[PDB]
Every structure is written in structure tokens, then in C-alpha cells.
Amino acid sequence: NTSKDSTQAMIDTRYDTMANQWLQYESILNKLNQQLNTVTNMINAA
Amino acid sequence: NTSKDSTQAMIDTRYDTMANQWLQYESILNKLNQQLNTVTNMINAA
Amino acid sequence: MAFGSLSSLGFGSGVLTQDTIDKLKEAEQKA
Amino acid sequence: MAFGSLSSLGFGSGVLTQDTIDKLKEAEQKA
Amino acid sequence: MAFGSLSSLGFGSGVLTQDTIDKLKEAEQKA
Amino acid sequence: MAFGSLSSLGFGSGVLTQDTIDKLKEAEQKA
């Protein structure tokens, strides 16, 4: 049980950072989508 | 010509930042792809 | 793994249908 | 969820087949 | 025309590419 | 524009062919 729990910890250790990465690029693609909409707002405006 | 050049400046102004965003998410997706390969390297190793 | 890679990151790929609504309702009910 | 979105609203996507007719018949029978 | 109809209403169908960025830049330049 | 959005960011979508090689060669030649 002890060894299994150790490896279990290691398992979610990776995927937690991966979740952080997912939300990270969610924010980045929100920045780029909002900025594409921003240049599109300038395209429509300017 | 002057006014046209002003708006021309405004044009590339947006797309320069957009290029920065593109390389930005290139780096972020490189981080996530390398980290997916990292958790995959742990999956294969561990 | 030297080529282990993925192409994109996506969302919302598809079209709304009442069936999808029902699936979401079931998931919510469960959780 | 900031990007949680769907693209369209659709209907009738597809082609009629006797198999679909049979499925509808079964659904009606049930209900 | 009794069957003249369309299935859906859609947007954003696709993936961003620098090529699309260039096309948008050209369109803006024109207009 | 409230829905003006794109789904993904992608690369390398496709398969190599000698034709693509020729196209790249032409582009390089030009530039």
C-alpha cells in the first residue's frame, strides 16, 4: 500500500501541472482571441 | 499620402503584437508538448 | 516518442443538439 | 469555460434510410 | 423550393493559421 | 462579433508529398 500510494502521488503530480498548462493556454488563447477581436474591432472601426 | 501612411502604421501595429502572440503560444504549446512528453517519459519510465 | 506530439488545442468543436443537452443534463444529475 | 461555446444550431443533418425508419418505429413502439 | 432550406447557422468554423492572419490583414488593408 | 472566435491553433496538418516539396522549393526559389 505504501509503495502504491507513492506512485499514486507521482501520478497526479504530473497531471496537476498539466492542468495548470491547460488553463495557461486557455488564458493565452483568450488573449489572442480577444486581440484578434481587437484588431477586428479596429478593422471594423478603423 | 500622410494620412494613408498613418493608417498604414496602425495596420501593422496590431499584427506585430499578433505575431508576438503567435510565438507566445508556440512557446506555451512547446511547454505543454514537452510536458506531455515529460509525463509520457514518466509513464514509460515510472 | 521523438515524434510524440499533438497538433492543436481546441474547444466547442461541433453543433448544439437537444441530445447533447440531454447528455449534459445526465452528467449534471450524476455529479 | 471562458471559451465554452458551440458553433451552430442544426437539424435534419443526414439522409433518410429504411434503417432510420426502423429506429423511429422502435422508438415510437417503446414510447 | 418546397425543400429550399438550410440546416444551421454557424461561425468560427476552423482553426487559426498565420495564413488566415495574412488574409485578414490584406482585407483590412484594402478596406 | 460577439461570437467572432476561432476554435484552435494548429500546425503540420497533413501528409508529406513530393508535390509539397516542389511547392516549398518554388517558394524558396522566389524568396
Residue numbers in the entry:
A (entry chain I), B (entry chain C): 593 to 638
C (entry chain J), D (entry chain G), E (entry chain C), F (entry chain E): 1 to 31
According to the publication:
The bacterial flagellum is a macromolecular motor that rotates and acts as a propeller in many bacteria.
In our cryo-EM map, FliD forms a pentameric architecture, consistent with the low-resolution cryo-EM structure of FliDse, with a similar overall architecture consisting of two pentamers in a head-to-tail arrangement. In addition, a significant subset of particles adopted top-view orientations, with clear 5-fold symmetry. This allowed us to obtain a structure of the full complex, to 4.7 Å resolution. A pentamer is about 170 Å in height (the decamer is ~300 Å) and 130 Å in width with a 20 Å lumen. We note however that the map shows a wide range of local resolution, with the leg domain well defined and with visible density for the large side-chains, while the head domain is more poorly defined. The FliDcj structure shows that the FliD protomer folds in on itself in a ν-shape, which results in N and C termini next to each other in the leg domain, as illustrated in the topology diagram. The overall architecture, as proposed previously, consists of a D0 domain formed by a long coiled coil, consisting of two helices located at the termini. Connected to the D0–D1 leg domains are D2–D3 domains, rich in anti-parallel β-sheets, forming the head. In particular, we note that the D0 and D1 domains in the flagellin are largely structurally similar, and thus synonymous to the D0 and D1 domains in FliD. As a consequence, the C-terminal helix of the coiled-coil is not partnered with the N-terminus, but instead interacts with that of another molecule through hydrophobic interactions, forming the pentamer-to-pentamer interface.
